């Protein structure tokens, strides 16, 4: 008679075993399935085609943790990878509601970790974002963010990380998503609280901080137009997005963090809060044009990472629009901006992409628009050489050449900068905008 043995069943058998009466077979099959899918795109795709996904999703409702946790670990692996149809299939058999239903029942960290990791994987697909925003938002906030944040101490850092990563992804575009998240009771409060807690533990680099700050940057995007009754008793809810404290947090992250994505996100949130014409935008821009904050922001211009350089540029740009210590911005911004243009000894700026260079040029233009001393510091840093090098390039694009001409035409507006170039033989038409 037939002893037990180590034979490997075929995929279709494993999938059928998901429906065997014995819970222990279901759970071992789900587990084995998770293992088969691990780092194996082809297997993930075959599971979809064999119609395993709705089976796995059905098992989330199974009362026994071994089965539902087993099914979930498999879905997590299946929700990861290049075949985006695997994520869509999970959505199409109501995987998100099922994940959410299980989340509300979960009592343990390991299961909550797997559910939220799966949601984080799903949230990267654009077609699943509003599904998650509409069906998981409130469970993620009420079951995870608020209780584990410490807000009313911090714990379950890994689950919080997954969960903020998920909310960050789904809020990466769509005003409807930003508005829905901004409106969720306690969500903004607790994110700010988490980021403060971490900074207080001397953690300014964790993925948790990263996900929270990126999320906060998303919610700060267009807050001035999207806040209910844009018309602008303590601040609460989305009002916290533009109070002094969070602004101070971004600035402190600019000084303490070494992680490019966190520096970019913090500079980005500052940029977003500074973009709008509205009372709070004025307050925040005015506060940010002080010596310490300007230096914190300008210093990211010496960061070796392009995307950080670009973020600093955008932030500096929005500060310059209504600036009033013309000397200040000028002093803090111009030398580092000019260093990041091609045409000197800094190798890296010869390798920046077109969008970065245009960002810097536009920012330069804004900073010198009515600021003779800024224009002078430009001239003093050999930045005219660089503008001409860009403008007269035989290899850069029309947009980049034009961006350089714009700055040149602004420079041409000032008599004191004009006469010295005329002494070289330059005339205004050498630098036409087209």
């Amino acid at each position: 008679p037939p002893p037990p043995n180590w034979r490997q069943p075929e995929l279709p058998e494993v999938i059928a075993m998901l429906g065997f009466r014995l819970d222990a077979v279901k759970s071992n099959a789900a587990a084995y399935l998770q293992h088969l899918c691990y780092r194996n795109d082809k297997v993930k795709t075959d599971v979809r085609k064999l119609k395993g996904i709705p089976v796995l999703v059905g098992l989330l409702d199974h009362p026994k943790k071994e089965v539902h946790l087993g099914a979930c670990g498999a879905l997590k692996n299946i929700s990861f990878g290049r075949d985006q149809d695997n994520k869509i299939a999970i959505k199409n058999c109501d995987g998100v509601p099922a994940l959410v239903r299980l989340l509300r029942k979960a009592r343990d960290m390991d299961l909550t970790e797997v559910i939220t990791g799966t949601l984080w994987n799903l949230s990267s697909h654009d077609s699943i974002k509003m599904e998650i925003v509409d069906h998981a938002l409130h469970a993620l906030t009420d079951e995870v963010i608020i209780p584990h944040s410490g807000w009313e101490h911090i714990e379950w850092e890994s689950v919080l990380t997954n969960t903020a990563g998920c909310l960050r992804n789904v809020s990466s575009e769509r005003s409807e998503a930003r508005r829905k998240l901004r409106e969720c009771d306690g969500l903004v409060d607790a994110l700010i609280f988490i980021v403060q807690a971490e900074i207080g533990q001397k953690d300014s680099d964790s993925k948790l901080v990263e996900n929270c700050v990126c999320l906060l940057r998303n919610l700060s995007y267009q807050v001035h137009r999207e806040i209910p009754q844009a018309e602008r008793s303590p601040a609460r809810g989305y009002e916290l997005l533009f109070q002094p404290e969070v602004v101070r947090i971004y600035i402190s992250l600019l000084k303490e963090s070494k992680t490019p994505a966190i520096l970019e996100a913090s500079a980005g949130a500052i940029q977003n809060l500074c973009a709008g014409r509205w009372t709070y935008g004025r307050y925040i821009r005015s506060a940010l044009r002080q010596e310490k904050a300007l230096s914190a922001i300008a210093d990211l211009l010496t960061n070796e990472h392009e995307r950080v350089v670009k973020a600093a540029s955008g932030a500096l740009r929005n500060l310059a629009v209504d600036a009033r210590n013309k000397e200040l911005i000028g002093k803090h911004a111009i030398p580092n901006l000019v260093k990041n243009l091609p045409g000197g000894q800094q190798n890296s700026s010869w390798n920046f992409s077109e969008d970065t260079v245009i960002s810097i040029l536009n920012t330069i233009n804004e900073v010198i628009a009515e600021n003779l001393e800024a224009a002078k510091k430009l001239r003093e840093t050999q930045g005219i050489e660089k503008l001409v090098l860009i403008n007269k390039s035989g290899n850069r694009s029309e947009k980049e050449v034009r961006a350089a001409a714009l700055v040149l035409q602004t420079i041409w507006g000032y008599k004191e900068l004009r006469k010295p170039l005329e002494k070289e033989g330059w005339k205004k038409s050498d630098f036409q905008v087209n």
């Binding site: 494993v14 099959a29 293992h35 997590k76 692996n77 990791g117 997954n162």
Partner: peptide, 18 residues
């Protein structure tokens, strides 16, 4: 966007799969 959930390997008892 980042699929930060990632993927994990798993344990199982192959002998019970029949």
């Amino acid at each position: 966007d980042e699929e930060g959930g990632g993927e994990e390997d798993q344990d199982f008892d192959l002998s019970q799969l029949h």
